[PDB]
Each structure stands twice: as structure tokens, then as C-alpha cells.
Amino acid sequence: FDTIKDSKQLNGLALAYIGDAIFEVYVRHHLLKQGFTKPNDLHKKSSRIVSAKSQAEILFFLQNQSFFTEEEEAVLKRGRNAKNTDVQTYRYSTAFQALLGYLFLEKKEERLSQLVAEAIQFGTS
Amino acid sequence: FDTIKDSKQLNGLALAYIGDAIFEVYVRHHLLKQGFTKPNDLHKKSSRIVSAKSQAEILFFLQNQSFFTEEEEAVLKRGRNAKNTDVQTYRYSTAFQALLGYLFLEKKEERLSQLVAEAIQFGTS
């Protein structure tokens, strides 16, 4: 993908907007790779993993592992504050989505794969 | 992403399932790159481009350019026949989604970028 000029200046919602799609590709790819193959199977599986509640729970989990660097912490803060979903779950899921968006747009490919794998480990289990 | 064993044997719906997410990342990235930045802006933009009607129209367009190779034609046939949306628009959009899924999973990265850019040229305009 092309570099986007000043992508790191993007507001939290704009970062969360790309992050949410990125997470969906990783999760759907994961489920295919596990040998699921049926439609109603795969959509039930991915909607469960990609839901706001589940992304909130994932982020909490990763915070207790002290997974993140200070740069990533700053991007999560940006997403959490970006101006039938709970307020706190909205804030945390948007934080997680903004970080994925950020890592993707900044082309931190290795770190993004690491983070999503961790997220998927927890969110599937 | 890891290779998925016998990914090319996947049924049309399973290929369309990953293709649809892939298309969403490309389209969202495109809109960010164009310097859109507002939420209600970007979602209105991408839902318009990624809708079944618009993917049907895109595929028709590309067919008249005789864009596709014979291998890709076979994958479109698989998606079109995979067992408030119109029947024909469903069939064509699923065909387009299965091809993107296929190109992605088979790691035909250059061809996938080519196809999506063409799709986005037409679908935005």
C-alpha cells in the first residue's frame, strides 16, 4: 500500500476506521486457516472476535501483559479519547482499532502481526 | 500472512468471505490516502463503493475491458454459482469478492493491487 503523508497525525477515529478493517482481514484469514469453511460458521466466529466487547477485553488483557511501547500507549490514548454500545467498551475498542490502524499505516508490519496474533490467541480462546 | 493448505480448493463463499474484507481494507486505505479524514465522510464513501450493487457494476465494467485471465474467469464462475439484495447483484458481487479472496490467498499481490485499483477507479468515479 502507498504511504499516506502525515498518516501519523490522523485523528483517533480515522486511525480506528482503517484498523477495524485490518483486524477483520486478519481474523477472517485466521478462521480460514483453522479449517473452517462454512459460511454461517465463519461469520458467527469472526463477528464474535471482532465485536467491541471482545476488542475491549483483548486490549485489557494486553495491558496487563504490559505488551505496549510508549509510542503505542500514546496512540491508544488518542483512540480512547477520540470524540447499543457501552461508553467504556466503545472507548477501549476504538483505542485497539486506532493502534492497529496506526501500525498498519506506519508500515510496522512485524509488530502488527505480533499484536494481532496475541489478540487472536486471547479472543478466540 | 501464512499460506493456507489447498486454499485454491475453497468454495466460492469462503473465498468471497476473505475477499470482501480485503476489498474493505483497500477501499478504506484509498479514502484515507485521498485526504478524507472525517468519520461520517469516510463511512458514507466506503459503504457506497463496497456495496453489492457497486461491486456488480465494477465486475461488469471489468468484463467489458476483458480484464481477466482464464484462471481468474474460472474463479469468478465459482463465486457467481456459490450456493434486500437482488439475486443477480448477489451473484456478481460474490463472484468479484471470491476473485479478490483467491488472488489474496494465492499471494498474487501484484495482480490483486492492479485489479483493486482498476475497481476503485471505476467505483469511485
Residue numbers in the entry:
A (entry chain A), B (entry chain A): 24 to 106, 113 to 154
Question: What does the published report state?
Answer:
The class 4 enzymes, called Mini-III, are homodimeric enzymes and consist solely of the RNase III domains. An enzyme from Bacillus subtilis (BsMiniIII) was shown to be involved in 23S rRNA maturation. The natural substrate for BsMiniIII is 23S pre-rRNA, in which the 3′ and 5′ ends of the molecule are removed to yield a mature 23S rRNA. Here, we present evidence that BsMiniIII is capable of cleaving a long dsRNA substrate in a sequence-specific manner.
Since such structural information could provide crucial insight into the molecular details of the cleavage site selection, we attempted to crystallize a substitution variant (in one of the catalytic residues) of BsMiniIII with dsRNA. Until now, however, we managed to obtain only crystals of the free enzyme, not the complex with the substrate dsRNA. The structure was solved by molecular replacement and refined at 1.8-Å resolution to an R-free of 26.76%. Unfortunately, the loop α5b-α6, suggested to play a major role in contacting the RNA substrate, was not visible in the crystallographic model. A long loop between helices α5 and α6 of the canonical RNases III, including the RBM 4, in Mini-III RNases is replaced by an additional helix, called α5b and a short loop connecting the α5b and α6 helices (called loop α5b-α6). First, we superimposed the BsMiniIII structure onto the A. aeolicus RNase III complex structure and copied the coordinate of the RNA. We homology-modeled the BsMiniIII target dsRNA using ModeRNA and finally modeled the missing loop, minimizing steric clashes between the protein and the RNA. The resulting model suggested that the loop α5b-α6 in BsMiniIII, which is missing from the RNase III, can be easily placed in the major groove of the substrate, where it could make contacts with the target tetranucleotide sequence ACCU/AGGU. Therefore, we inferred that residues in this region may be responsible for sequence-specific recognition of the RNA substrate by BsMiniIII. However, both variants lost the RNase activity completely, suggesting that the presence of an intact loop α5b-α6 is indispensable for the cleavage of dsRNA by BsMiniIII.
